[PDB]
DNA sequence: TAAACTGTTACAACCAGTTAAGGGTTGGGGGAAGCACTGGGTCT
């Protein structure tokens, strides 16, 4: 076994980057695992190290990339790029996150960067937070690219919107 | 000089007959179903 760890930040984020991590092993295979709840942790239990995670995470990255091609800067009608986000300036972020994802995730090695995080991915982001008194000229919050995009896929095939 | 004795207190029939107990006609029209105010990212 490995018992994937899953930093705790907010039982919305973290849901989605275990629903990222779930759909990723049962992409692949991945047989006799299980989904172990603990609140916020949402741990899997599954015995394979890094074989079929990574080809589930490569499929679903194309697909989230033929479906984001296939719907229509390079605004289009896709849920994870515009069908549930709000904010004009995310139909653009989003190609250019997953064209950098692409060019990163491919030829077998991890990421360099970070990312930020949206509200339809956790409703407590923002770019004004307030440490003693007032807010910073950034956003101190940030998400890893792995975890950027396993949140996306799961918002994108697991949870469910109403426009 | 006395102060109603007694059989009797209605019988019998019958105790609504029929007919219909709404007929019709319309069952919300018609408008609107938040107007702004608060914008979040990525860059210089």
Do not use: C
């Not at 779930?22 to 942790?41: C, N, Q, W, Y």
């Not at 239990?45 to 984001?68: I, K, P, W, Y």
């Not at 991915?121 to 008194?133: D, E, I, N, V």
């Amino acid at each position: 076994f490995n018992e994937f760890k899953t930093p705790q930040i907010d039982p919305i984020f973290d849901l989605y980057v275990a629903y990222g991590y779930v759909v990723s092993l049962i992409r692949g295979g991945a047989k006799e695992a299980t989904l172990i709840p603990h609140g916020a942790s949402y741990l899997i239990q599954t015995d394979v190290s890094n074989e079929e995670f990574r080809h589930g995470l490569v499929d679903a990255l194309s697909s989230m990339l033929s479906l984001h091609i296939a719907l229509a800067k390079l605004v289009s009608d896709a849920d994870f790029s515009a069908g549930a986000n709000i904010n004009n300036v995310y139909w653009d972020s989003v190609p250019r996150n997953l064209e950098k994802l692409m060019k990163d995730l491919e030829k077998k090695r991890s990421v360099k960067g970070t990312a930020t995080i949206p509200i339809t991915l956790m409703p407590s982001a923002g770019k004004y937070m307030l440490k003693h008194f007032g807010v910073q000229g950034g956003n101190p919050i940030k998400v890893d690219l792995l975890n950027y995009a396993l949140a996306w896929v799961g918002f994108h095939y697991y949870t469910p919107y109403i426009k």
